[PDB]
Structure 1
Amino acid sequence: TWSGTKKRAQRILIFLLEFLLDFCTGEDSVDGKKRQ
Structure 2
Amino acid sequence: MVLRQLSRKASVKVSKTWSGTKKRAQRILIFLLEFLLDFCTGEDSVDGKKRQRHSGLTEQTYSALPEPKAT
* TM-score normalised to structure 1 length: 0.32
Map Cα deviations across residues 1-36 of structure 1 (whole Å, 9 max, x no partner). Answer: 999998653311111112110011279999999999
2:37 to 11, 17, 21: 21
Determine which structure has the larger helix proportion and give its number. 1
Q: Which one has the largest radius of gyration? A: 2
* TM-score normalised to structure 2 length: 0.22
- Structure 2: segments with no counterpart, 5+ residues: 1-16, 53-71
Which consecutive aligned stretches of 4+ in structure 1 deviate over 3 angstroms post-superposition?
Answer: 1-9, 26-36
Percent identity, aligned pairs only, is 100
- Structure 1: segments with no counterpart, 5+ residues: none
